[PDB]
Amino acid sequence: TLLQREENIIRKGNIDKEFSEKIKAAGGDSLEYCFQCGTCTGSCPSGRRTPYRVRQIIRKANVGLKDEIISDPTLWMCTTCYSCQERCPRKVKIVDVVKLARNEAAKAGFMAPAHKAVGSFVIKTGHGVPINDATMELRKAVGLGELPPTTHQFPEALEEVQKIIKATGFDQLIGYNWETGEL
Amino acid sequence: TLLQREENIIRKGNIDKEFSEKIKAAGGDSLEYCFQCGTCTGSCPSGRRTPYRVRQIIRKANVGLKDEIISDPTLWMCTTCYSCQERCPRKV
Amino acid sequence: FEPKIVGFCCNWCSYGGADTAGTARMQYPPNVRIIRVMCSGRVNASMILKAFSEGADGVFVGGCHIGDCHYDSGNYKWKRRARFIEDILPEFGIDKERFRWEWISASEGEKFQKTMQEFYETVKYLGPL
Amino acid sequence: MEIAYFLGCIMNNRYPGIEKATRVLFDKLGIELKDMEGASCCPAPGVFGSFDKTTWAAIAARNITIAEDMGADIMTECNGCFGSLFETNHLLKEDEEMKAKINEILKETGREYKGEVNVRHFAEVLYNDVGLDKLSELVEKPLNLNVAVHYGCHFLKPSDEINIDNPERPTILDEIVEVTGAKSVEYKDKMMCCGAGGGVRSRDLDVALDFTREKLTNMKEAGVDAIVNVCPFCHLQFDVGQMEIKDKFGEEFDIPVLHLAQLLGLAMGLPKEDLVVDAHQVCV
Amino acid sequence: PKIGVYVCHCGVNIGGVVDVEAVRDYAAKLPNVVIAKDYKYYCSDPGQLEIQKDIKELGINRVVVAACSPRLHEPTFRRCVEEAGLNQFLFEFANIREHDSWVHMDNPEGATEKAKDLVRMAVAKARLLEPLEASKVSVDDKALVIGGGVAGIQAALDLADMGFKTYMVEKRPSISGRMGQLDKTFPTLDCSMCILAPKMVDVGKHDNIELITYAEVKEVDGYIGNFKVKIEKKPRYIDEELCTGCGSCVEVCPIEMPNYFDEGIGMTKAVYIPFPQAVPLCATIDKDYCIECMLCDEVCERGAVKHDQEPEEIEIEVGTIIVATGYDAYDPTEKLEYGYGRHTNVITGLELERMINASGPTDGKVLKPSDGEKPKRVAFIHCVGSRDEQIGKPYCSRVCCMYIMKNAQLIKDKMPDTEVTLYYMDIRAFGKGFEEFYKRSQEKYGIKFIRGRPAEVIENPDLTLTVRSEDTLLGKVTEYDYDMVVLGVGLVPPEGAETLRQTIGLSKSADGFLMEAHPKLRPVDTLTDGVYLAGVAQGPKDIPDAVAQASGAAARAAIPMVKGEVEIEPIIAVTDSDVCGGCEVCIELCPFGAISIEEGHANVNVALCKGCGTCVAACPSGAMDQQHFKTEQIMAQIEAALN
Amino acid sequence: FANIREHDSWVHMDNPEGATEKAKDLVRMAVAKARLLEPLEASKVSVDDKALVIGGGVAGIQAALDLADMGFKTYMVEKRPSISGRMGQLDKTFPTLDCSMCILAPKMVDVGKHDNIELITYAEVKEVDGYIGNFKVKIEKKPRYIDEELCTGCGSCVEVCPIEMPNYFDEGIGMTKAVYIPFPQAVPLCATIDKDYCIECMLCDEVCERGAVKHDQEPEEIEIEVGTIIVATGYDAYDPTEKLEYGYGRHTNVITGLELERMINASGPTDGKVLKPSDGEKPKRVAFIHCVGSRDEQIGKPYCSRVCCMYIMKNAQLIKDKMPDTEVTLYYMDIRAFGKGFEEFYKRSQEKYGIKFIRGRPAEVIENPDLTLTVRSEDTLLGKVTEYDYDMVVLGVGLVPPEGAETLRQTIGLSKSADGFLMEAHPKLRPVDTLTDGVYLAGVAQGPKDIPDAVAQASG
Ligand SMILES: Cc1cc2nc3c(=O)[nH]c(=O)nc-3n(C[C@H](O)[C@H](O)[C@H](O)COP(=O)(O)OP(=O)(O)OC[C@H]3O[C@@H](n4cnc5c(N)ncnc54)[C@H](O)[C@@H]3O)c2cc1C
Ligand SMILES: Cc1cc2nc3c(=O)[nH]c(=O)nc-3n(C[C@H](O)[C@H](O)[C@H](O)COP(=O)(O)OP(=O)(O)OC[C@H]3O[C@@H](n4cnc5c(N)ncnc54)[C@H](O)[C@@H]3O)c2cc1C
Ligand code: SF4
Ligand code: SF4
Ligand code: SF4
Ligand code: SF4
Ligand code: SF4
Ligand code: SF4
Ligand code: SF4
Ligand code: SF4
Ligand code: SF4
Ligand code: SF4
Ligand code: SF4
Ligand code: SF4
Ligand code: SF4
Ligand code: FES
């Protein structure tokens, strides 16, 4: 059956004005004066190959459809290429709104495992892409040091990075467990 | 994956102008001068409980998206209640 | 303590700016008293000194933006006079923060309101002269 | 001239040839590259900026303080790292409350953000501080190459803040590339994203690979011999994604991927082993 | 001094905040005050009658009104006191509404105290006022009209039919403006030239109109009724009195140059006539392209070719000025994503107007620039150069929607098989018959409307153009191919607008067009007396709105010229010869040079003085004093403000 | 004159030979007629240097003042007891949000004091005869039952009157007495008795000190001779009662834009407070609906009313300034912000005041048991039906020709356009002339438009 009494109508029960106020207060206030020309969607390269529609994201953020935004997989199709923002005739900070919505979605548990894995790599070694043995050999062969002068080479720097992550609560966000060093 | 390279863009390969000409010649010529106010969808009782959107059907008929219309299940959600037609400001 | 403030505003822009603030109903403290002149070029140091000698705790002067004077050069002469007055006032125990002069355009009601509020706060903090 | 040298992750951990070529090129230009001891992920904006702004800003601010300690501007040759560091720098400089919050977080690490240095891009430093004439003088092996220039999204955008070149039709990278004797070839959708940004590569590999496949189809139709980039993130996308596209759809492009520093090293007669071509998955 | 004080309630605008009962009693108790009254609306007729009756009965010789700002109603009360026999300048205004009541709503007690202090200051000033007779100056019954478009033509014809001798200065060799370049007009699709050409001929034949084309206004000096204008007539190198416009010189000329009339898509010769209906029908030589071959000299039978012509200087004296300088079309080259100037088959709306014109460069055929063949698919893009903060153009151009729809309809009628699509954000069909025209574009001609602002225009190898744009009503990205793309460019102020604005001394609005005196009730007046606006000079609009504005400007400029006199305010510097030492530190401070030295004493010229008071403030000894702003008056006001 | 272009060349393009033969025949006919023509001297007739202006709104006031300042003696006939038109009823004006009365009242006083203007209010033009320069006009002055020469507009009669009747100025939401002054700034400031409500209690007679009350007054007949006529009769607001799906006149908390203008006016019936008609409390949620009575073939109104977009946005901005906590939503098809500063005003409605715009023409307005209103409408940019609740709904009614427009049009002998407004001589180049010589149009009489356009037309 095509019947579904909740998905095909918008009432006040679908609206969270606090979400819109939070987004605007956090640096996405420009979304208030989008007039829905659709230039952003036309400029969007991910909108051409996925169901992602940035204009509708901006509209939902203005209306206050939190649950519809944060739980939406297409919210993660934006590459932050800024093509939309360069062309918006109303000078809306589209990428800022997208990132704020992604922050809210992450707070609600809509984080992909691969992104959490990147976060765990940063926690463990300080590098989103840590070095592997083959690259160490390549570095040695070409006159560079076996390890780059980074958190790879300085444990105290890694400790500082871990202190920052603990202070910001990022480890709790991705569910990193220090005791076992797993997610 | 959310990737699908055909469903998220409209090109001339999705358009059949003969379909639009046939519809207009068969008694649906008024669809030419719909200005997409959305009164019909707001008046539609089936649009409130199904994915059926009559305004988008009219738009697709004008554009010529035959395959998108005829294969659409929601096309069969209309009860022919005439609520939309009584209120259309363009008398479509 | 409620400071006594005297204001001089040119007819064409600064007085227009105060009128704009009024029409928009931009609230500000009631201590200031505006006196109208045709041009800020009409203001000289004798008026400022007379105001301070008569009991004023602050003196404000408003003019057209440089290049916008109705009489086309008056605010330049006022600006020179105002710099000299700022030189003279501290020699008699009057802080130069009690003498403020600003360029206010006829449409700048909000700037006029903010100037009035801030000048009142400054003069009140300084205390009685 | 002295400048702090930020490395990032992908360059130093997957493609050291870019780093070696850059070090050699800057030594030939009389610019002292100072290592930023203890630097970490910038962090990659796609994931960290998407997850928590505060953590991203704090890590970037610590990286910036590493360079502030040496009293030197930061130089990056990754568009992703440049974007992250530059955005954090101009956010903390122009926002006192956010600066206070980030400094409160940084306190326990024994660091404080002062907002005393500038974040600069590798290509921008080459164009402004060195100039096209000095770069031309150092060319000893004028190249005969048709190259597709991939600007990457975060080199020039958001242009309201970066103000380096016009994002729609820039020419800075084309001029730098042509100083080497190679020819920058126009192709369809040249300013298109590679698909790796915003964390998309790790979230939906198929979407990012279609970005790359579209770009590669457009480049191939133009007949280019190589791809030139100023972003190790884009570099990795093109290099590894060509292999991934071959395995998934059996489509062969065989378009070598070079960093601008590597192209400059090739035109300057650097040793072949210094370019570390063995790091690349696509044979050059 | 018998001061009568009148405190206005203004309904509740003052009374609501300020106690008009306490203030009235305070005024009644002040020295020299013989009466204090309050009325609900003093500016109204009953209030003025009350003031006049009080003056007649109690013999008041000073009138003080505690009411709104003087900039609003000072002339009203000045005339009110005049009609009762009192002198104009024995009158004083206290500002207790904009300066007190509307800005201290939360402090009613402080508001009332401030009102008391302000009325005290006003009475202190009014005590020392004295009568001043205002001098009348004659108003010249002549008008200048700058710009020879439809608005300027209408204004000139209306002024000339009302009997006033009018000058019409036009920078192009011929009059017509942009209306002469149009093929048809919306919403009727009537020929624009067929209805404009008779008016152009009328302007050319009127006994009361002096038409000076190919000329610019270089200098403007003076004031209302008394404008001195220096005009520079550029050399045509053709004798206007002799040339008949036959066109043989054009036939023989070997050099080819762009025709300005054709907007960059039409060619003419170095000697050219802009269009067949030109007024004056005269030839013009552009020396940037002339090689001085003398072929035109030899072929001309009237002897009208003058290669040694020089620019001419004309000086006129007028009483009123009407600026009707129109607009330029926006240049979309800076919109790089749309590729104007880069893609071959991308054109603008005005270029399309020239192309669809039967008298245009292509003989009325819409042909692709790339190959000279008719396009089968045409896209129109709305709001190019308008409603866009990325280029600092946040306004609507107000006519592009309609002329886009009109040109789509014209392309359909000429080539019925053509497909036409419009990319719009809003369809602004607001005028009379405009909504019906909009519906007819769909019902009759089958034009397709896509609600979406295009993201990009991509030129394909075969030179066709892909418009990449979201269909926001389908909610999906589309990439559609077209043989031609027409940019709906907006309207911008004409080239050299700032020079003329500075020459006259006018202000401009946020959009860059000239600013009217009042947005609602004085749309054609400016704040400079004797200068008026007509047509797109005041902002984008269509032909009937411009014509209505031109007629209104003619009426407004005629009023003072019919009156024949204006009053000069006597607020001027006066020198006390017995006190003046001839130091002369005052002369250079007058920007108008009103002060000279006679018999070792400073002497002010009333005609030159404007009443700024700068010289008076500069005079140490006080020999110089401004009327109505004397030093004693301001000193009394300062004293009363604090005591 | 031989007509060989409209009658021959443009209608026989496919038959050039037949076209040339027809041209030859037509020129032969023209010469045959011209052979027998003879001279005729045309007679000149004097043009009276007097003007009549019908309608005392902003356009009519402007036209009368311009004619009188040019030296011509002008008559101004106004059917209401006072001049001002619809501009006097507005609180503020777009796009500046300036007070309309503060700028209109001086012009009204000027009209009332001008030596060259004869103001005849509470009067109608009954007959027009003659031609340009030679118009004979019969005007009927209705009985005020108050002596205009004696009444001072003090208002004591109003204070003592026991009967209450609707005030026409307040557009059906304000009350006054059987003897009333339409508003404090009325010109002439004079009282008027409506005998449909007067009970003849003579309390006003007893309280009046000027002896201005005249219960035995009769209608007066005035005959004037003028040279020109300017029709400036304005418009009426559309009555949305026939739009049954929106429930105007049935739902308590549904109002029109003009009623809202009266309600937001500080001098209006509610002292400038926007209050629900149902309970007299401020609404927390307000919806505006665009294009009510316009752009609608279901009611035979296919034109745009041209001002409803802007005054809708203006009144939304005013509601926000007065009650910042109020939520305001506008339901629109197109936003027609075409005028000078209009697009900036439109952007300011969003950026500064936080007004919400929904692109969708509402399907229905449903009154809930608690008297709140559900607007059922598609959000076409979300592509989904919405049912949103509001405490107040304001219909953006369009402009229609005024009551009695056809009578005056027939009296003068003018034609009308497809929209029902008076027709100008030429759409492009003669916007204020008619095809009747000596008769001119100004303001909304010629079609909907805003105040500056009407003022420009009046001057023209
Ligand atoms: C493509 C297009 C199509 C249009 N179609 C229509 C339509 O169908 N119907 C319609 O009603 N309107 C239409 N318009 C709008 C219409 O053209 C304007 O309303 C009208 O041209 C304005 O007339 P104007 O006299 O104010 O200005 P213009 O027509 O621009 O005339 C101004 C004149 O002033 C002269 N001038 C400029 N500067 C100076 C100077 N310093 N000294 C002396 N002279 C000077 C110019 O050379 C010009 O002759 C269209 C506009 C465009 C761009
Ligand atoms: C709710 C609303 C808000 C608006 N807000 C604005 C705004 O903010 N800014 C703006 O610029 N415009 C606004 N407008 C439009 C503006 O009101 C009109 O442009 C203007 O009123 C037109 O003036 P007018 O003189 O042509 O007509 P009117 O104002 O209607 O005046 C016509 C006069 O003619 C009289 N009359 C009618 N028939 C006869 C007759 N037979 N004999 C004698 N007299 C007769 C009438 O009684 C009236 O006094 C608004 C309109 C509405 C409905
Ligand atoms: S481009 Fe800007 S104004 Fe247009 S829909 Fe996107 S965010 Fe809104
Ligand atoms: S930044 Fe995101 S939303 Fe904007 S164009 Fe790029 S992918 Fe699309
Ligand atoms: S109601 Fe009529 S005009 Fe509106 S969208 Fe439906 S069919 Fe089109
Ligand atoms: S007839 Fe009824 S069910 Fe069918 S589209 Fe119209 S309103 Fe919907
Ligand atoms: S005089 Fe001024 S304050 Fe008094 S009623 Fe008139 S406008 Fe209002
Ligand atoms: S210059 Fe001589 S030849 Fe040329 S158009 Fe004039 S009259 Fe004819
Ligand atoms: S002299 Fe000049 S204008 Fe005349 S024919 Fe020669 S090139 Fe042409
Ligand atoms: S009139 Fe239409 S096309 Fe022109 S700027 Fe306004 S909305 Fe855009
Ligand atoms: S400054 Fe005074 S004293 Fe000197 S010349 Fe002028 S008026 Fe005379
Ligand atoms: S008052 Fe001003 S304009 Fe007059 S003489 Fe003095 S300086 Fe010159
Ligand atoms: S009729 Fe008499 S009491 Fe009534 S308002 Fe007129 S003068 Fe006053
Ligand atoms: S006589 Fe009529 S108008 Fe007068 S008070 Fe009685 S009811 Fe009212
Ligand atoms: S102006 Fe706006 S609200 Fe009024 S009819 Fe036109 S589109 Fe509808
Ligand atoms: S007029 Fe204001 S400063 Fe000269």
Numbering used by the authors:
A (entry chain C): 2 to 184
B (entry chain C): 2 to 93
C (entry chain F): 3 to 131
D (entry chain B): 1 to 284
E (entry chain A): 12 to 654
F (entry chain A): 104 to 563
From the publication, what sentences describe this entry?
In the methanogenic pathway from CO2 and H2 studied under laboratory conditions, low-potential electrons for CO2 reduction are generated by a flavin-based electron-bifurcation reaction catalysed by heterodisulfide reductase (Hdr) complexed with the associated [NiFe]-hydrogenase (Mvh). Here we report that under nickel-limiting conditions, in Methanothermobacter marburgensis, F420-dependent electron-donating proteins (Elp) are produced and form a complex with Hdr. The Elp–Hdr complex uses F420H2 for the Hdr reaction, fully substituting Mvh as an electron donor module for FBEB at lower nickel concentrations (<50 nM), at which Mvh production is not detected. The Elp–Hdr complex forms a supercomplex with Fmd or Fwd to perform electron-bifurcating CO2 reduction using F420H2 as an electron donor.
To further characterize the Elp–Hdr complex, we performed cryo-EM analysis of the 1-MDa fraction. We obtained structures of the ElpABC–HdrABC complex at resolutions reaching 2.2 Å. The complex is a dimer, (ElpABC–HdrABC), of heterohexamers. The architecture of the electron-donor arm, containing ElpABC, is similar to that observed for homologous subunits of the FdhAB–MvhD within the Fdh–Hdr–Fmd supercomplex. As predicted from the sequence, ElpA is a truncated form of FdhA and does not bind a molybdopterin cofactor. In ElpB, a hydride is transferred from F420H2 to FAD, and electrons are then transferred from the FAD down a chain of iron–sulfur clusters, eventually reaching the bifurcating FAD in HdrA. ElpC has an identical role to its homologue MvhD in structures of Mvh–Hdr and Fdh–Hdr–Fmd complexes. Cofactors including the electron-bifurcating FAD of HdrA and the CoM-S-S-CoB-reducing non-cubane [4Fe–4S] clusters of HdrB show conserved architecture and coordination. These conserved structural features strongly indicate that Elp subunits functionally replace Mvh subunits under Ni2+ limitation by providing electrons from F420H2 for the FBEB reaction that drives reduction of both CO2 and CoM-S-S-CoB.
